[PDB]
Swiss-Prot record, chain A:
N-terminus is methylated by METTL11A/NTM1. Citrullinated by PADI4. The modification Citrulline is found at R5. It comes from Homo sapiens (Human). Keywords: Acetylation, Citrullination, Cytoplasm, Isopeptide bond, Methylation, Nucleus, Phosphoprotein, Ribonucleoprotein, Ribosomal protein, RNA-binding, rRNA-binding, Ubl conjugation. The chain holds residues 37 to 156 of 156 of the full protein. The modification Phosphoserine is found at S7. GO terms for cellular component: cytoplasm; cytosol; cytosolic large ribosomal subunit; cytosolic ribosome; extracellular exosome; nucleolus; nucleus. Belongs to the universal ribosomal protein uL23 family. Component of the large ribosomal subunit. The ribosome is a large ribonucleoprotein complex responsible for the synthesis of proteins in the cell. Binds a specific region on the 26S rRNA. May promote p53/TP53 degradation possibly through the stimulation of MDM2-mediated TP53 polyubiquitination. It comes from the Eukaryota. Signal peptide: none annotated. This is Large ribosomal subunit protein uL23. Residues 1-31 have a biased composition (Basic residues). GO terms for biological process: cytoplasmic translation; translation. GO terms for molecular function: cadherin binding; RNA binding; rRNA binding; structural constituent of ribosome; TORC2 complex binding.
From Swiss-Prot, chain B:
Transmembrane segments: none annotated. This is Large ribosomal subunit protein uL2. Belongs to the universal ribosomal protein uL2 family. It is found in: Cytoplasm.
From Swiss-Prot, chain C:
One of its GO terms (molecular function) is structural constituent of ribosome. GO terms for cellular component: cytoplasm; cytosol; cytosolic large ribosomal subunit; cytosolic ribosome; focal adhesion; membrane; nucleolus; nucleus. Keywords: Acetylation, Chromosomal rearrangement, Cytoplasm, Isopeptide bond, Ribonucleoprotein, Ribosomal protein, Ubl conjugation. This is Large ribosomal subunit protein eL8. Component of the large ribosomal subunit. The ribosome is a large ribonucleoprotein complex responsible for the synthesis of proteins in the cell. InterPro entries: eL8/uL1-like, Ribosomal_eL30-like_sf, Ribosomal_eL8-like_CS, Ribosomal_eL8/eL30/eS12/Gad45, Ribosomal_eL8/Nhp2, Ribosomal_eL8_euk. Gene3D superfamilies: 3.30.1330.30. Belongs to the eukaryotic ribosomal protein eL8 family. It is linked to Chromosomal recombination involving RPL7A activates the receptor kinase domain of the TRK oncogene. The modification N6-acetyllysine is found at K9, K72, K192. GO terms for biological process: cytoplasmic translation; maturation of LSU-rRNA; translation. It is found in: Cytoplasm.
Amino acid sequence: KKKIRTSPTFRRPKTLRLRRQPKYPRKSAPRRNKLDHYAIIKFPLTTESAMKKIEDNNTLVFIVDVKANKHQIKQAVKKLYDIDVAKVNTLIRPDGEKKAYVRLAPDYDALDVANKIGII
Amino acid sequence: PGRGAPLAKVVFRDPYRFKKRTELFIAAEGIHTGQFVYCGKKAQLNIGNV
Amino acid sequence: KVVNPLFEKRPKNFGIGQDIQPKRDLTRFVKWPRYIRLQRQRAILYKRLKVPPAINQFTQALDRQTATQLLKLAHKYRPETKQEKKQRLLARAEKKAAGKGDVPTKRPPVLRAGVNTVTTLVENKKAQLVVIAHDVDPIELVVFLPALCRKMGVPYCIIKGKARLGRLVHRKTCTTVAFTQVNSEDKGALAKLVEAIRTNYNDRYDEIRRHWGGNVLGPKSVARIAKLEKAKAKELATKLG
RNA sequence: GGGGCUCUCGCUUCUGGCGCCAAGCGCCCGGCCGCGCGCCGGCCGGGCGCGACCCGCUCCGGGGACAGUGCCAGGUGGGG
RNA sequence: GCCCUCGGCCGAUCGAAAGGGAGUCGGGUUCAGAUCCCCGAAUCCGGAGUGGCGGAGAUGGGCGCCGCGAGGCGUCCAGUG
Ligand SMILES: [Mg+2]
Ligand SMILES: [Mg+2]
Ligand SMILES: [Mg+2]
Ligand SMILES: [Mg+2]
Ligand SMILES: [Mg+2]
Ligand SMILES: [Mg+2]
């Protein structure tokens, strides 16, 4: 005495959808991250332009993995050089390698950092 | 475009839900904007009525 | 007397062009899914078309009293479930190891189920009462059963629900069941059933053979035919007298 | 008085407004205080029915055993 | 999580480096890059659960009062500019 149809359209009733509860994982173990920090930072650039960036803009120039974004580059540089960076600019070179200009925070000296890295 | 007759945009009320319905009648000669037209069995004999 | 004066009725009228229509029942005017439309249209077709007697005879089934009393009798002869069979087999194994031996111990009368089993019993005249479901969907499993039971002399009846017969035999659906020999305390109940079953089905088999079904028009067609008939009848009545 | 009998078994036409998510009534179920005699007083909530008539077997209308389709037969067929 | 109520872009998706489409400009700087680098001035969008600060809402009226009065006290009444 209460089942009513105020609409002339029959819509498919909403049924219950269960979440997957598999009896075995399809992958035995998660495959490890290949794009870790050492993979991200390949080698620094030591050209005249790179040196001028170090001594003028407080910027270190790196050659990075082409699949790494600015956040990944920033975090990788921070972790594997113990420095704080302000911003990362990124281009892809005509030969296909990605180049990152990493400006350092005002309280870090890119000259001293490049000396510790060994790229002076 | 491509038609020599004017088209009359006519607005009705939906009798079943709160909404305005817009129809695209073929304009009979004489009708003007702001004119009421009446469609139905009990409508009267006036230009523009259906 | 103490009612708030601010309260007043605000009646809305649902005439044409006035306050919009209320949300009323529209089930009759629903765009139903194709399967719902198809099964309803099939139900209608089985009323439009002239149904042959061999298919139409299954629409005549037992009434409530006889069907319920027959099912009550048949509940005492349900086949044993898997649990009951396994437990009597365990008891038989233990007692046979004890020394009971073979000892058939009068295998109790049971309800035989299934169309092939039942039709073999009917052919051998080993059946005392046949119950046929009225709603077997590929209905060729059963169309021969009433005529076969009449020819063999075994009383037969048609009951509403292959699902009911299935629940009788611990399954979803049973086409037909048969009564083989019955217990002494239930012989009277079986005879009381068989006599009424015999009068209602096997006796009037000749007119069952000829009773065609369907051939009834829709309510709209019937109503308009009736109003045409009434118009011609009333003008004839004013003519006469 | 008033029924077999009829059109109605209707609510919207002088205006370039407005219009939905129910008022009203009735029946109940909670919590609160309390005459502290129960249909019993009042207060904070919720449900149902009528409002919005009942029944029915094709959504409504138009065709309809034709059209159409499948196969054969005859005609026409420089369109190819 | 389930239920009630509401819920037609009525059709996936693709389709413009000249259509639509928020918001960056000035100066300096290289051998070759700059409206992108540096300097200096802005600006749009998004976010903020424990609420970042303010301001707005919003702080009045009547009556009994206390109190030399001002100013305070108490019962009511308003207050989505
Ligand atoms: Mg870029
Ligand atoms: Mg030729
Ligand atoms: Mg839709
Ligand atoms: Mg696109
Ligand atoms: Mg553009
Ligand atoms: Mg240039």
